[PDB]
Amino acid sequence: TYKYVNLREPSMDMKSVTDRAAQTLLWTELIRGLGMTLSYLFREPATINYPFEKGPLSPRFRGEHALRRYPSGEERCIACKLCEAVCPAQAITIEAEPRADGSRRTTRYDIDMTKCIYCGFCQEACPVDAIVEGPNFEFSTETHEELLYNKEKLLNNGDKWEAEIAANIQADYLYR
Template structure:
């Protein structure tokens, strides 16, 4: 809170004088400055060493050469980066990447089309279609994941009762357009093997899948 002090100006006898606004402003700012404490008001040392250092920083740019020396020293150190994509760093064992469907050792597919993963998905990125086989078992005919919606939370992997869907350490799913990031999981003979249709285009007009 600033306090303005208005001083009464008394002219000399026989003269007429009016106090100027600048004088009032000067006293007002003086009162405001007096209310604060300057914590950085540090007096410069006047010894010969301090004077020499300040003169060298001003005239010889010693701080600039110190920074350049620090930069040059990193040229002889081991680099902290790698030459990606020719070199790749290690991934954590708990890394959650692209999705894959598993099989049993006898070749039978694990997915039973219970659609728990589709129900638990917070982003609603999973679409499952199933049909009943001749033996009465229900198996998946379509298992699609829209990677533009997937947040890699891992809920689908935790909700699966038969450990059919997993997230592998593969993460390179870059495409040219957004409609190509629709991952069609195809059950293969080997476990953890993922088949990605890179040129998958969904035709909304015709209503079918074109490859």
């Protein structure tokens, strides 16, 4: 339907002109307007004190990468080549080989941390539930030669915590 805003004439009589000529000349606006609305400084400021206090997050957060493994270790990956076919940005670079025991595994596994556009399409394409976007934004290295990840970074980075990650996925696998 409709609504009309700023469609109204002034009253234009003897009374209300003095109501408007008290505004322009002796400033009944602009002090009652914003000498009071601003101060109003007497609220408590809301500043996260960052090196000690940190802010809220959520158990589906996206961040640093990881590769989990089973109870007593098996390197949960099986090199099934899906986490590399739905990266939209073509970050993953897998090259498998039949490992000597007979079960197949990776040899090289490479995730750029610069082409990584942070979908969550690796996290959800995996059948065997291995590669997980882990919940730690701790980053900021100083060389481009470093942010390229190998296989044997991710496991170290994926076994620095699993008490962190496995508390998250157990809360959230019930929806997906």
